[model samples]
Target: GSSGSSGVIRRGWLTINNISLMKGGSKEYWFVLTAESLSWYKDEEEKEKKYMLPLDNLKIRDVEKGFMSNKHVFAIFNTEQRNVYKDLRQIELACDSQEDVDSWKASFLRAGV
Candidate 1:
């Protein structure tokens, strides 16, 4: 029988890790936001997971548009050294619009990240 699983809070395509120092330009990835963590895949298929960040002790904030190319951008980071998958101290994600940004923020808050 199918039992309870990690419910998805929200999922969409978002541009991740768009830093100025990055050699190549930012690329879009499929992001999955669950109650326990946020995971990104190479595509919408979810067959290949690039990485996953736990929501515990995580912080989220809006990024200034002056620094980023996108006007609707937000950042997420852990408060302490709990990341085990990657060396991601912090990452910025860009949305398609202000409404998407607001929706993502609300979803993160609902997930208690």
Candidate 2:
């Protein structure tokens, strides 16, 4: 077994709900944005500059939590090459190009894949 624990695991999230809505009209899906959060950093001045979704270097999980709430209602899209994962179960970060990443996201869209 490994000494480093999943106890200290901080689950960072990338929210693709809007993108999901754009793709499939409110059918919610979540990726575990945990891994990418470790690899990237966001500061105040350099707020998101592009529509990005990190494909390979990302997280995975089948856990879904419903958030049709007033407080959690605002849409969030991190302006960077990120995969917004929630309730993470696994991670896969092997994407080579932005196009590849986009394709992965596109799959959840209407004829975009």
Candidate 3:
């Protein structure tokens, strides 16, 4: 089932505590940064994409003292047009280490913003 690839520029796993503040602020998932989007799956074996952030809808940056963390934190904002009454989408992640965060940033850069 290779679509030539997952369109993945880079792939990585999440910590057990990958939280999304826009939601309940708990839980996490496995993911891949692709040329056109950042998608997540239920687990390493699941094939259907559970969620995805179109690269066109993202703006990523390294952060300090946010997402309840001060280290290796990167915030991804969903910049797609949102309705005035709807909540914005965002995912705040803290890598297992600074090196991993750096790697994530690099992939995001390659994704072109």
Steric clashes per prediction: 0, 12, 0
Order the numbered candidates by TM-score, best leading.
Answer: 1, 3, 2
The CA lDDT of each predicted structure is 0.74, 0.33, 0.65
Q: Which scores better on TM-score, 2 or 3?
A: 3
**Candidate whose lDDT is highest:** 1
Which residue pairs show backbone clashes in model 1? none
**lDDT minimum window of 10 residues, candidate 1:** 17-26
Q: What would the per-residue lDDT of candidate 3 be over residues 1-113, giving only the tens digit for each residue?
A: 55554556777677433354556642567777778777777766558777666776678755546347655666666665452113434456767898897788878888787
lDDT of 2 at 87: 32
Give the per-residue lDDT digits (tens) of candidate 1, residues 1-113. 44576578899988865443464553777889988888888787788786777777788765656754646777776777554335556677877788998888889988886
Off by over 4 Å in 3: 3-7, 16-26, 64-70, 81-88
- Cα error, candidate 2, residue 104 (Å): 23
Q: Record all residue pairs in model 3 with backbone atoms less than 3 Å apart, i.e. clashing.
A: none
